[PDB]
């Protein structure tokens, strides 16, 4: 008897960095995913294990809307079974992912002349993230046998890199806003329905 607040995720004024990706938990509401697809202002809208029209006739215990910004050429990493900097060290979908990945170009919003340095991604990590794992540490990364102890230097690197988005970049380097819809099916009362 109440609308799911998808707009405050999709239409948010600022998006998270991918390494610190945002998660909105969605419960106790009615969600219309037909308006989402029929917006048709999305460069990517891909569903795994579901179909938009079909899932509008379904219920789930919870829905997660994860949102962040990556480069265009990295959007293909937001999918099950992918590897690469973003999937490995920033935002990992499970192999059995059930849900949808939505992306659109946000160059007019997230890039600026001289570079937008607000958006970052994790470049160095010793091991891959588990699915839906989120790592926000900024410890200096040790690439050799000598410990770093918080100071940059040879073999000692700050683990995050800025995208530095500029509007005249090639499209593959321009910012894309991403929302990942995950449909949690628990053995519990379903609270999100079409």
């Amino acid at each position, epitope marked *: 008897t109440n609308l799911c607040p998808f707009g405050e995720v999709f239409n948010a004024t600022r998006f998270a960095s991918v390494y610190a990706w945002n998660r909105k938990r969605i419960s106790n509401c009615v969600a219309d995913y037909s308006v989402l697809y029929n917006s048709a202002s999305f460069s990517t809208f891909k569903c795994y294990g579901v179909s938009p029209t079909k899932l509008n006739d379904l219920c789930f215990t919870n829905v997660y809307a994860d949102s962040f910004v990556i480069r265009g*050429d990295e959007v293909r990493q937001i999918a099950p079974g992918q*590897t*690469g*900097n973003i999937a*490995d*060290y920033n935002y990992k979908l499970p192999d059995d992912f059930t849900g949808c990945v939505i992306a659109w170009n946000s160059n007019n919003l997230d890039s600026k002349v001289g570079g937008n340095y607000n958006y970052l991604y994790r*470049l*160095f*990590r*010793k*091991s*891959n993230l588990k699915p839906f794992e989120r790592d926000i540490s900024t410890e200096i990364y*040790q*690439a*050799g*046998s000598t410990p770093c102890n918080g100071v940059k230097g*040879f*073999n000692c*690197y*700050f683990p995050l*890199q800025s*995208y*530095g988005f*500029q509007p*005249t*970049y*090639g*499209v*593959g*380097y321009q910012p894309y806003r991403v929302v990942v819809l995950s449909f949690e099916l628990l053995h519990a009362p379903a609270t999100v329905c079409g």
Partner: antibody
Amino acid sequence: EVQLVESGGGLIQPGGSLRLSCAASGITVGWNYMSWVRQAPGKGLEWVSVIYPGGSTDYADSVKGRFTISRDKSKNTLYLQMNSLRAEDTAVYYCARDLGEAGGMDVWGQGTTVTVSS
Amino acid sequence: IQLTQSPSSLSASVGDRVTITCRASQGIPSSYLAWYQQKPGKAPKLLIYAASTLQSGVPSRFSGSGSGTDFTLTISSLQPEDFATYYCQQLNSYPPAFGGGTKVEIKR
């Protein structure tokens, strides 16, 4: 001194196999993006393969399904297994440490020479 | 992404100012571009990364700049050990792109 030392190159027939090694000191192979780059006689550099700190790998198209990059952390060593070798693969092979935008390929081996011929 | 390096070869004398350009086909972050030097029979050597950062140990007469699609390597006072080939490289991608290279050779 920080160094990478390649070995394993030599003469090999077309269709044959060869494993290259790159023994590292002063950087930890398992904690770095580690790459193989080759240079055929008279040509420029060609990136061949990479292994990420987390263990993901990638390969140039011309080498996919024939070459395998790998590593032994206990021996701080990087490897390139090369199968189904072709005359094209004749080159000097370098291992290098890749820092991406945090630094270039700053550490290179001396190279090891692979000659593929019948 | 393709990198077009010009000129393919350049003639210079000791003490000259030398300028080598690398044109990218689309517009790339400045942090993606590195410059390397190579001499015959030797491994490449990193000179500059992120388009303008001098690699520690590299003489200060080497300097990088540029942005967008157009990047430049400048050797301000050419020294005899500088006659060599130079390559630009586009990092952060697999495969990376290499420019065709510029051979700096002795004018006479």
